[PDB]
């Protein structure tokens, strides 16, 4: 099982300037619950977006995708292709825009947090992957984050 997990604005923006323009504690808690114990795969820019004090994310096999043969990610595995990262019962791709697009053909689950923020797309933004008609989705109710933004969880699945 390969799953993708991300949070997006209604516009599809997931990232800007190498970081994320919101932070919902409830989304972070859901992310930790879904990924804990499993392999997490991320692009090198997403690894860079994590503060060194929080890396590697605990209780998970941290895998970083990079084309740089000598890139060092302390506490993580650095691989040159996505297929090297797929040797576990459960693998979660945790970002960013490039790696979501690369991993989508392998994926059968997407856990999506929709953030009710009006954030028009801009040049340079990272975007959520486009899900075609093979995906079926189950939506949750709109909820209030303590950060002030509404959010809801989508669970997409396909065979
Ligand atoms: N809202 C959310 O839930 C999340 C948002 N984000 C945001 O996403 C943005 C980053 O996404 P993005 O800029 O798309 O970069 P990524 O995080 O997807 O990393 C891209 C890098 O991954 C490596 N890579 C990409 N494709 C391949 C390949 N086919 N083979 C080998 N290595 C490859 C390269 O590393 P190298 O250059 O070293 O070769 C490339 O520069 C940031 O703003 C981040 O905050 C991230 C996670 C979650
Ligand atoms: C602030 O530190 C982090 C930034 C991004 C992530 C990855 C992520 C978060 N939420 C959701 N739904 N999906 C994701 N792939 C994690 C982080 O700290 C653990
Ligand atoms: Co689990």
Please describe the structure with a list of short key phrases separated by commas or semicolons.
binds NADPH dihydro-nicotinamide-adenine-dinucleotide phosphate; 31% strand; DHFR; 3 helices; 14% helix; monomer; two-stranded antiparallel sheet; alpha/beta; 159 residues; EC 1.5.1.3; Dihydrofolate Reductase, subunit A; one-carbon metabolism; binds 5-[(3,4-dimethoxyphenyl)methyl]pyrimidine-2,4-diamine; 9-stranded mixed β-sheet; binds cobalt (II) ion
How would you describe what is shown here?
The chain is α/β, with parallel strands linked by helices and 159 residues long. The protein has one domain: Dihydrofolate Reductase, subunit A, CATH 3.40.430.10. Strands 1, 3, 4, 5, 6, 7, 9, 10 and 11 form a nine-stranded mixed sheet that branches. It has a two-stranded antiparallel sheet with strand order 2-8. Bound molecules: NADPH dihydro-nicotinamide-adenine-dinucleotide phosphate, 5-[(3,4-dimethoxyphenyl)methyl]pyrimidine-2,4-diamine and cobalt (II) ion. 5-[(3,4-dimethoxyphenyl)methyl]pyrimidine-2,4-diamine binds next to strand 1 and helix 1. Its EC number is 1.5.1.3.
Topology:
Elements: E1 2-9, E2 13-15, H1 25-35, E3 39-43, H2 44-48, E4 61-65, E5 77-79, E6 91-93, H3 97-103, E7 109-115, E8 126-127, E9 136-139, E10 143-144, E11 150-157
Parallel strand pairs: 1-6, 1-7, 3-4, 3-6, 4-5
Antiparallel strand pairs: 2-8, 7-11, 9-11, 10-11
Bound molecules: NADPH dihydro-nicotinamide-adenine-dinucleotide phosphate, 5-[(3,4-dimethoxyphenyl)methyl]pyrimidine-2,4-diamine and cobalt (II) ion.
């Amino acid at each position: 099982m390969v799953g993708l997990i991300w949070a997006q604005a209604t516009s599809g923006v997931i990232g800007r300037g190498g970081d994320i323009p919101w932070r919902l504690p409830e989304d972070q808690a859901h992310f930790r619950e879904i990924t804990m114990g499993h392999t997490i795969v991320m692009g090198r820019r997403t690894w860079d977006s994590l503060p060194a004090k929080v890396r590697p994310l605990p209780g998970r096999r941290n895998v970083v995708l990079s084309r740089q043969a000598d890139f060092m990610a302390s506490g993580a595995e650095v691989v040159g292709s996505l297929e090297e990262a797929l040797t576990s019962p459960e693998t979660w791709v945790i970002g960013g825009g490039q790696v979501y697009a690369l991993a989508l053909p392998y994926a059968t689950r997407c856990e999506v947090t929709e953030v009710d923020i009006g954030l028009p797309r801009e040049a340079g933004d990272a975007l959520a992957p486009v899900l075609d008609e093979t995906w079926r989705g189950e939506t949750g109710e709109w909820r209030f984050s303590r950060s002030g933004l509404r959010y809801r969880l989508y669970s997409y699945h396909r065979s």
